[PDB]
Design a protein around this ligand. Structure first.
Ligand SMILES: Nc1ncnc2c1ncn2[C@@H]1O[C@H](CSCC[C@H](N)C(=O)O)[C@@H](O)[C@H]1O
Lengths: 12, 274
């Protein structure tokens, strides 16, 4: 599993 | 878009305009799920249905993830390309016509160039920077001139558009980067195209899933998309820029074995020097 090429996103 | 229009993914494009500061309300540009976005999406869905390709990519990524960045694996295989804007969205945001052309583009941290290529027809010469070896090869196959990361500031010429898409949250020195950009942008007519994933969460990609915190802090702060955008005028001012226009756009990415594509939330700005 590679997901989004930009990386994982956090929260506000 | 219509409040009852199905499959328009409103959440990708709308914001609560009253939550924006007044000066940002005046320059917000509404974007929509347009033809070029759908082509990228339909292309990605097709790709994700090529099971033998996905399985190969996933086996290579598994075997070599300890020795190479994710970005370099993607460039090695030619996979996981991304999408920020269509040519129409880019032109509507810059306020140029389909045939508008100028001299020099510089795309910093251009990745594999599939976002750069949306902008390329508007320029006679295209330059780019990139830290990934395999991505540099992808940029060179597209015939872009790849400059060193301390080379572009010292070429003896200026750039008519500098694009800095989704790099500020991935580079070690974002504030030095913004200031370098201002110092070599053509001042009478040059513009900067900037894209940032919100919520702002920066780090520097290394090998093996490892990562580091950047050594410079961008002062981006807020509890939702609108508040974080609201902190950006002052960040850009420190670097000598005012926002000329901006929009909300889905930061799309080709998919894998588990999802047809991936989405992040981009804020996209046109900056003019001040
Ligand atoms: N200091 C730096 N100079 C040039 N590229 C950098 C960099 N720090 C990180 N990068 C590169 O920046 C990229 C961020 S991914 C963003 C890619 C593309 N601009 C897009 O919007 O889709 C990665 O390819 C990474 O290798």
């Amino acid at each position: 599993h590679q997901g989004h090429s930009h990386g994982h996103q956090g929260g506000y | 878009m219509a409040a009852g229009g199905r499959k328009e993914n409103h959440q990708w494009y709308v914001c609560n305009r009253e939550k924006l500061c007044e000066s940002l309300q005046a320059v917000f540009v509404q974007s929509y799920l347009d033809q070029g976005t759908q082509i990228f999406l339909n292309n990605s869905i097709e790709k994700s249905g090529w099971a033998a390709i996905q399985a190969y990519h996933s086996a290579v990524s598994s075997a070599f993830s300890l020795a190479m960045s994710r970005t370099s694996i993607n460039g090695l295989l030619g996979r996981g390309s991304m999408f920020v804007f269509s040519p129409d969205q880019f032109q509507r945001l810059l306020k140029i016509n389909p045939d508008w052309k100028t001299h020099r583009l510089l795309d910093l941290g251009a990745g594999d160039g599939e976002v750069t290529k949306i902008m390329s027809p508007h320029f006679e010469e295209i330059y780019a920077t990139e830290l990934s070896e395999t991505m540099i090869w992808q940029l060179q196959k597209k015939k872009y001139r790849v400059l060193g990361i301390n080379e572009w500031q010292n070429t003896g010429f200026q750039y008519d558009v500098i694009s800095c898409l989704n790099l500020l949250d991935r580079c070690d020195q974002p504030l030095t980067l913004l200031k370098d950009i201002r110092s070599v942008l053509e001042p009478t007519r040059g513009r900067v195209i900037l894209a940032l994933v919100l919520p702002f969460h920066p780090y520097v990609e290394n090998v093996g899933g490892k990562w580091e915190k950047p050594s410079e802090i961008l002062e981006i702060k807020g509890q939702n998309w609108e508040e974080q955008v609201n902190s950006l005028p002052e960040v850009f001012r420190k670097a000598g820029f005012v926002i000329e226009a901006f929009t909300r756009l889905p930061y799309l990415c080709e998919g894998d074995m588990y999802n047809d594509y991936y989405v992040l939330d981009d804020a996209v700005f046109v900056l003019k020097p001040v």
